[PDB]
Amino acid sequence: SSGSANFAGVEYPLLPLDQHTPLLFQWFERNPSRFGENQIPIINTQQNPYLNNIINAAIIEKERTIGVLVDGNFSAGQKKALAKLEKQYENIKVIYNSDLDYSMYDKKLSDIYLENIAKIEAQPANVRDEYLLGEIKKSLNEVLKNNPEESLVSSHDKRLGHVRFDFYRNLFLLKGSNAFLEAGKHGCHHLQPGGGCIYLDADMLLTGKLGTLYLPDGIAVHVSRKGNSMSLENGIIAVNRSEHPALKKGLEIMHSKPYGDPYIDGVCGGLRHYFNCSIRHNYEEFCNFIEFKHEHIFMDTSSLTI
């Protein structure tokens, strides 16, 4: 009707993401004091021109809502500089991660561990992952001794680096367009409840308008190529609707797997399970099928050398 894509002998209609689908960037800052007290607390060096890349995307995509999901202990002057950025660029909306409610996606760690202890103990002795069982029982024991109410959100809230960025990235994309409405962003043009979202890594340069994308069941992700290898990546995630069943599958894996990774399980696991890229299927074929491709998305050049 408007396109079709094939993977593992199943046809998937290309669903449109209209030119109003918001863009999303993420900046979670551990050390905001490294920036001036009156500076936008986003990295903007010639090695990492992230603030420039966000602005350049907002300049190109005039009609489209541009989200910047931020977190960290920003000074009063750094929040005013972020407030001023939303004024210089009408389509830029700064969303503080602390202003969103993720409790509907949460689960208690004690519930996950008990489920898995019961699942593993039902198995016969000749198939039981005896190392994993001991580790889970150990993880449960530390929860009951230190923080018996610890959940996926509270535990991920304490982690450092990418694992906490990746965790909230998945949950924001499950909210989709609703997240801008929940955060009380005014003047979001054509932004609909139940609407999708397009996450972009800040090291990527938009050089032209995306227009309308056509993606298999309304989802696609970045596929990175390094040397002669390719890999599913979370550097780009495009969904045409809130609560996309492939990301919902990724969350269900987080709710059942004892040490679920937001990237490996929440995105790669969710996608693979959803489209039946089983272990007996061609990973390379799935990458070509699910890959987000657009002529106006440019890979970071600053990385490169001889």
Numbering used by the authors: 26 to 331
From the paper:
In this study, we report the determination of diverse protein structures by experimental phasing techniques carried out at long wavelengths on beamline I23 at Diamond Light Source using S, Ca, K, Cl, V, I, Cd, and P as anomalous scatterers. Native-SAD uses light atoms naturally occurring in proteins or bound to proteins.
Using this protocol, we selected 10 projects solved by S-SAD phasing at the beamline, including soluble and membrane proteins.
